[PDB]
Design a protein around this ligand. Structure first.
Ligand SMILES: O=C(O)c1ccccc1Nc1cc(Cl)c(OCCCCCCCOc2c(Cl)cc(Nc3ccccc3C(=O)O)cc2Cl)c(Cl)c1
Lengths: 115, 115, 115, 115
């Protein structure tokens, strides 16, 4: 799997389950084209977004729908979403894990990139 | 100052100096319209972005140009930029500080909302 | 102020007010000896912990009493406290700010070392 | 596995490999007794520290030897180690993952606690 997303909840100390994730790829006309989407599992993970064939060199945006998640838990958070924007595969094919750790007024994101 | 931005460097243990910051507001036609911008100071801070008069309720995006910062340091980074997207909500006196802590393959952002 | 502590609350998007902070220095017999302490202010800050004269090179521990903070808010937390352990090193004018960002099941700490 | 540690490197965007981890348990005399230790794998993970039988209710400290890690990469970091102190199993047996994300002058730690 070349692109995986993992989301964790810093309030509950749990995976963040059923979080919507949308991936976009920047097109030649500078617009963000829909690329893939899904929801995190019971483990906070989202796999199977793309294939090595389709995940070509480009600029990608991973939008994680954090506000919808918090609101479903009774919390009015600060952010609309977390957005992770990066160039992928520009020094050859890599496997990318995009991890996010969520709180109501903060989040962090890291990437783990491997061969 | 209803809106301040503060950027810190987790590699050097320092303010992140001379980082470009762009603020956008969501318009009517769902377009991100430029709103304010600047470069962080020697203290990693950016003040004077807007006024209480202009900073009305709405959806805002703060783009922090992290990739160019790391390139200036000779360090290969992951993200193109950090994007912080939020709704400004009245209901009383509020000042917003958007803080970001930067590493090459990670960032963190929090909002400190006070009065 | 050669040593400041700043604590922020990632759930409320606010300074973490009235948090107990204890600082220790490593002695000769490898015992943590109390050095300084206080409670964070309304701005989440704790100043006046020590003087340039007393804050010599050595190994220091800053203990931030996070569990009691979350208990005061009625929120079940994971950690007993956050502990920040570091060597203070001269070689020129240096001021240390130990920042912490708190969530119930997570914390983050950075050092901003300036002159 | 009731206790797992995962460590990631925010500079390289990689697991933090070969990081020493020491676990202590607070004894009746208020002293920290050695409990378990190991080093992170190629995946940044450390499994097999303990068993459900031996991992009883108590206050535990997980010390992650971050300074040794950074120094081996040519970096002089701020912290001596990251310390994670928590009560375990005080509302019945749980599975704990202690995750840490490391930078030279910052780290974060979260816990994922499951049934
Ligand atoms: O990644 C995996 O693969 C993974 C998989 C499974 C499990 C775990 C996995 N890892 C993993 C682990 C973790 Cl801990 C993780 O979270 C990373 C959390 C990063 C913490 C956020 C850092 C907060 O920064 C700060 C801090 Cl300290 C202070 C401040 N304030 C100030 C500091 C100084 C001066 C002024 C201020 C201010 O405010 O005016 C602002 C910020 Cl912005 C992630 Cl995203 C993935």
């Amino acid at each position: 799997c070349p692109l995986m997303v993992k989301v964790l909840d810093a309030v509950r100390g749990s995976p963040a389950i059923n979080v919507a994730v949308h991936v976009f790829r920047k097109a030649a006309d500078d617009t963000w084209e829909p690329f893939a989407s899904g929801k995190t599992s019971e483990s906070g993970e989202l796999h199977g977004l793309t294939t090595e064939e389709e995940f070509v060199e480009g600029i990608y945006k991973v939008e994680i729908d954090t506000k919808s998640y918090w609101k479903a838990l009774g919390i009015s958070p600060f952010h609309e979403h977390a957005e992770v924007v990066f160039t992928a595969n520009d020094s050859g094919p890599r496997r990318y894990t995009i991890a996010a750790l969520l709180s109501p007024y903060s989040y962090s994101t890291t990437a783990v990139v491997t061969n």
